[model samples]
Target: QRRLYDQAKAALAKGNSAPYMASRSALRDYPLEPYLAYDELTHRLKSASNEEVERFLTEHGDLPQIGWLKLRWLRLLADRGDWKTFVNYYDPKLNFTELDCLYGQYQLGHGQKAEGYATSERLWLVGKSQPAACDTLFGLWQGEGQLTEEKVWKRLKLAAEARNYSLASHLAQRLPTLGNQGALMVSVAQNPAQLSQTGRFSQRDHATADVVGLGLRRLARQDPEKALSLLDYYSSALPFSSDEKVAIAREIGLSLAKRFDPRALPLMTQYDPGLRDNTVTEWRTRLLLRLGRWDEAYALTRKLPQDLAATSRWRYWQARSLQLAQPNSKEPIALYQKLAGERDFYGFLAADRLSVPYKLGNRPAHIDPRVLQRVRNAASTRRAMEFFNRGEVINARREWYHAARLFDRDELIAQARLAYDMQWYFPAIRSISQAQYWDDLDIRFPMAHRATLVREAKNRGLHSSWIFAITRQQSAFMSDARSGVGATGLMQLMPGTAKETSRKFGIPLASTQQLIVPDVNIRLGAAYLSQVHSQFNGNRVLASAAYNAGPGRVRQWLKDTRHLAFDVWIETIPFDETRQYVQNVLSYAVIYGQKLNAPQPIVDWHERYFDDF
Candidate 1:
């Protein structure tokens, strides 16, 4: 097969018809992921705030690792005067310093350069001061009217050699030579050493790293006890690299403030009075929650923006507060019910909180895992496969409600499957305003063969969403939609993939046309999803990337961003189509999980990188 395809490809290339030759076939064989509507929007391009970035990441999933995406994101930060995260990308030797220099100018633009330079230089000289960006002060001083060529040259040359004394002496000597013109340069060069010796200068001798970030984050999470112990060694002579120190000090005055430290409490209380609606307030709330101040925690949460109001952590804290205020089942139960009913992260948490022996709607049920497994196994048989194959297509084409008529209420497995097959999303979304339904459980198609397909896919360690997202994206929950790319039925498996999967799964295939049937489509699609996911080393993100853009395109994106952290690299995928496609899948999966009241999969990108400082 490979040899035949290569021959045809070579023939096309030789004929000088590379552009049009086999184009449709290539597109058909290797489908271009349909471009999303908002692919060009660049939602976080103008505002890279944590909230904005979080929403974007959550909405899009892992973004494509394109160089331009990263540059655009960084540029947005630069425009917003967010040099904190902007300069963070700086590698002293990486030639990317042009951005840092440009950003320094942007920051200094907020003030009169000449006047600010004089003031900064005065502070540096007499009072001994050190600023984070020394270039800002020096750039300004050099640009000032009073600084002559001789004076500027002396200070510049001395500073270049990193000798504070020589730099200062040169400045002073040039003062006599250049009259009053040399004062500012002399002061800036000499006085910085005084500040540096006094510890007023931000120590920039060491590099900041991800551990500093993680340590600071741990402090926010109220594991400050662990932060202190873990970061104490970092504090001694080095003083916890400037970034880590700032992070620790922001957490509790300093890194010494351990768990239950009374001194830190006083400092925290004093700071709490002045902190309004900001990260400071978030920190206070987190620390308060850790301290067991339930009411205080709830009060703080209520003051947060509306979007954060319904978070699982917030509701959990609120419930805790209610329980602490008055130990009674009535209020807590009411809160728990509200949480469990809400279709959000918290709702799943509420379900988790629910004691064993749960009921869905009006049915009484005891879900024994072994019994459920047995039921699932029986539903995956050949006869069951045909029934579901026909059922999904009929329900999709005719808008038939399969569950109500054909399913048993006590056996939700069949009912769930029918519900999945019959979901009418087209007219509802097209005609209605904000019409949405979150199926609170996996919609199982009850036939034995479909069950077997699902089980095999699961055993291969692929997320069911791999199939669901692809199907939903390709055909919008429709079981019979066909595309020019030759994708057919619910799962949209290509003819070749279908044939191969059919053979592997032992499903009899009549012809390529039968691939359009919903059952065959789903069986093969789900199986193929599992196969691709395993081939990509069990990374759903990569597998989904491969599924949309093909494994070759995915590898290209990966290669382009081998140096970047996974999360950042993912955010910067260059291709508009693949980037948005990945985001859509992740968002759909999260939404689906929320709908099902399932716990979110734990995602950790930290394990992918080494701790660099």
Candidate 2:
């Protein structure tokens, strides 16, 4: 059967559709049957009739490949003007804008113009441009009386906010004599320096406000001081609303604070308290802490809104501030006691401070055999299992998600357990995470590559739990995982990074293919990890940031600071991806530590990484 499956797959790959179809027919009862059918549908998709495609989809629509084929079938229906069938086949959950537009056109053709135009309006309100098929919908909208100048202005605002200058320009064409104004908005959005050169902002209205707001946002990114200076110069002359002024100030303050610029603190204080949000206040608090302004930091945290100040993060920072102000104060110890009761990165840190045991609160999920069997016998599960067995991991995951979408919370847990039983560990974790059954400690945090990770981390003088945490987050134990940006394998090493690490290990450089090998990838990744750890002065926070966002960016971030507390520094890291990556790695490290049955102070390792010098 394996031989027949291989032959069929090879035939399909070589475009021998006739032999492929024959082999598919022979393997009709086999587990690989759906894949063979997928190959035939893919090859015949261009010429396949709606009935043929629909029949295949009806039988095996649970498969991801069939879902993709269904999209092609809709496209064919749209081209052939089969509006009735097109409407019938449309799945709003798919959220394909192009198909939605086609459905809207069908609505118009069937005399449901009011409902059709409403759909068009919703689709057209986007900050970015829509598909070309939307041109038809837009034409209908304009010809009818729905595309008002007011809506055009609204869309322009969205476009400016999205920084989609092209879309702004296109939307501007909706009103005559506003082309120059639109062009000015685009120029300011693209180049903030143009704001100083332009003087039309002296006139205050929605038009001027939109242009000025966009310019300030763009200028803030380039020169925050310049943005603040411009606002100071222009606010008195222009009748800018309080809301508009605050918006501009917030943007400038956020930009400066993100880089830990010395100017950020003073600039932020000028804004009215009403103008500030969690982002502004959070960074301001961190900057104050980083500057060792303990009195001000304590006051700032005390002043945070009730809900914001009550969070464990703010509470921890507030406690640290008290500890800084009065070394003998027991209030800080009380706060630590409160925080030490949870299981998280911050909780572990709090526990380490009091030299108390971590509250991992491990709760393995109770599995019902019938529920597990039900999920295992599901058609979608079978298809996913088949894909997994054939090493089509990407396809398997897609099918798993498609199948899981139909499941309730309990069913999802059973599906995750089923994946675990199949040893599809990564998808199992993903399923459970999606189900929000987070307390399933054993399955959620598995010890799949225990020996390799422990040996490599020990050899390199690195923490094994930290290494495992990175592995879990990087690929969820999927050895063949490949990112769109070209990072591959369990540790997601980029090609150049992998090659360089291979060379640093004094091992022959491996090909891209060899980088997917777990042992090879782990060795190289661990070596790179050690290199970055040394470079970052053994600070795991900085090292983890460097691993996600290159070492160069981490260096740039460090230069922006004068040695902030580790947690504060992690929050201040500019890129959203890198900031989240650092937090996730650290948090997962604590969980992994618990899973590995490490000592009470799993966070003591992290404490050593925190430096203010």
Candidate 3:
């Protein structure tokens, strides 16, 4: 059956209909028959009758590629100006923005001008440019005078804020209401240094205030110190609103705090004296912790908005600050005593202070057998398992998405358990978590690739749990994982890093494709982990941070680091991503260790110091 299917596909590709027809009937019961039929229909679409095309669409509606095929047929009808047919077949759930643009035009051409023009305006005013099909619709929209200069300036500002400078400049060139201010905003967006030419910005209107605001904020990102000086000059000449000062100061202060600049706290102290903006307030707290001004950090945490202080992150920071700034304080000990019972990065860190145990709260998910059987019998589930068994992972994922839409919480957990039983780690983790069922540690934290992981861990002199934790954090054990930045495999090693590590270890790496192989990736990744581990004096926290943000950045972070507790060092880490990364790795390592029947300390005896790298 499989051989005939392959032969039919080959014949279809070769346009040998005689052989394709000869074998097609014999493969009728094949699991992959829809693909064969889809191929033939798509190839023969132009010459086929409408009845024939619709028949394929109706018969194979369950196929994962059905959307693409439907979209193709719809577009074909649209290209033929068959508007009635296009309207009848169009499904908004297809989520093709380009088709939405075409539909808007169809509405405008037909008599629903109000709704069409409204959609046209909605589509036009976005920060990003619309599809090219939107051009005709927008042209018609503008000819109605609905696309006013004010509207153009709105989108231009949005584009500027979104850092789409070319679009901003394009819009600016035609803006008459904002006049030269529009062009100046674009100029400052492109190169904020132009704000040094202060005399050119001597205007006293809202538009000019906006231009100065844009210039100052842009300059803040480049050099917050320079932006501070510019804000003084601009504020003196312009009627900057109270809100404007707060917004610009928040931007400048946030940037300064990110750099750990000494001036950040004082600048925010003056402008945001009320501490109304939560983002600025949060960073201000971090800067205080970073600069060793724990007294100020403690005071700020005391005045934190009710909601902000309620979070475990702030509560721990606040408690830690009180202990440092006022060493004799009893409140922090009580606070730490209470926080130690929770299970999280901060809670685990808090547990270390009190010399207590981690509160895992590991409750298992109870699966209903009836619900499990229902999901097992689902058409999509059957198809998903077929694709999964056949090693068509991408198609299997699409089927999961369909089940996600149809299932309720119990049904979803059943599906998750099913995926887990199949050892499909990624989908099971995602599916159960999205169902808001967080207690099932077994499904969420699967010990995937256990044998190779243990071998590599032992070989590299690292804890097996640490390797498992990093895999869970990096890619959730998806062996074919590819990161946005080109990291690949279960461990998410960058291609260059893999290649370099291969050379360092004398491992054969004919191509970087070896990174996708579980054994090769685990071998190279464990060695790389050991390399970073040695680089940071075996500090797992620092090594984990290095793994995520690179050793170069970890070194940079250390240059600014002062002697303090390990938690203090982490709280002061500049990148929020790296900060949480170190914490998650540590906390998750403990969890995995517990599962492996090995106790993992939140901070190892040798790893706990912030005295010196």
Candidate 4:
């Protein structure tokens, strides 16, 4: 069957339709017969009848490559001016501009006037300009008076907000009258500080309100105090509504809170008296925490919205502050015990406070022979394994993603178990996670590349679990994982970082491509981690932040936060990504440490006591 499958694939590749078609029945029992069918259908689609194309799609709709084929067929249908069939076969779930604009055009021609106009408006109101296909649709929308000045103004604001300055200017220029309000808005939107002059904004209408609103939000992001000063002056001069004032205050609060400004708490309480906005309310308490105002912080936590109060983060902080304010309180101990029963960053920290063992919450996935066999026998899984075995990493992952999506929740767990059994750690983790079955420790945090990780970590005198946590969080053990910023490998090493590490450590590396090799990545990655670890005075918390946000930025953060406790400094670390990265690394170290039967403290003894450098 393997020989026959290969022969048919070869024949199809060579464009020998006769032999390929002849072997179709023999290839039916083969696991990867769809590849042969997909290749043939995709290539021969131009000559194939609509019924033939439809039949192929119907038969292989669940396959990974079907979307590509479907897209090609739809474009062909559109090119052939088969409007009715195009609309009938259209997958509205797809957000492709060509299809959407074409679908909108079809609707406009077919008497779905309201629906088509809505689609056109949806397509038109985007920040960036639509595709060339949308030109005809837009022309019709304008000619029919559906594209109003108000709508154009709305899109201009969106463009400015999205920082598509060219799009904003184009929209501004297209608005009625040479001396227009939209163009005025474009200038203010670009330079928000110009509104501080107070003479620029003259009108009391919605147009001026929109301009002032955009300006205030922008100014708040840059200088919250300045925006706050202008708010009342503008409020008296213009007619800024209650809701707009609240929204502006929300932005101001966020900006001030991010900087740990003293005014953030007071401004937030004044404007958002109800404390409805989670970002504002959460940041208010965080700022209080930053200032070591324990009693005030604890009080705010008690009054936090139910959704915010229920989270382990706030709950931990509440108990933490209560303990800080009243050292003899038993209430905090009870809170810590309850929180310690769970597993996460805060939960582990809670355990540390109580000097109790961290709860791991490891529940291995159920091994149902029937479900496992079914997932194993699925066509998509077969193809994924074939690609994986053949060293086609991307294609294999694509197939695995589709397979995970295709399965029922129970079947997903079984497939994850199967992948784990095969030692395919990345896809296994992804599969179980897609099922939201996170407690499967064996699959979720498998000891992939254990020997290299342990050896490299030992050589650097670093904890192996720390290295494991970094690897798991960095790439989920996906060797070919490439971050958008050009990091790659199991450790997701950046090309520049990899190059520098190679040079500095005297490691052999011809190119950044070698970073994908587990031994090379682990050795260099461990060395880099150790370098930062030393640079940050052997504190893993600071080292973790340095690792993610770079050593220089972490240094700046430390200099600015001299008076803060280590935990407090971490919470107020400015960059959301880096803050979360540090939290995950700390918690994962505990989890991985426990997995290795060598439990690690959430932070090392030396790491616990921080001071000004």
Q: Candidate 1: where is the Cα deviation over 4 Å?
A: 1-15, 18-283, 328-330, 343-345, 348-437, 440-613
Candidate 3 residue lDDT tens string, 228-264: 8888889888888888778898889899898888788
Task: Identify the leading candidate in terms of TM-score.
Answer: 4
Off by over 4 Å in 3: 1-4, 7-63, 73-93, 107-114, 176-182, 239-245, 266-277, 295-310, 611-613
Global Cα RMSD, each model: 20.5, 3.7, 3.3, 2.4
Q: What's the alpha carbon RMSD for model 2?
A: 3.7
What lDDT, from 0 to 1, does candidate 1 have? Answer: 0.46
lDDT: the better of candidates 1 and 4: 4
Clashes of each: 14, 0, 0, 0
lDDT of 4 by residue, 424-512 (tens): 89888888889988888888888888888888888988888899999898898987778777887888788878888878877777676
Q: Where does model 4 exceed 4 Å of error?
A: 4-19, 22-25, 79-81
Better of 3 and 4 by TM-score: 4
Cα error, residue 540 of model 4, in Å, equals 0.5
Better candidate by lDDT, 2 or 4: 4
Each model's lDDT: 0.46, 0.78, 0.83, 0.83
Rank list by lDDT: 4, 3, 2, 1
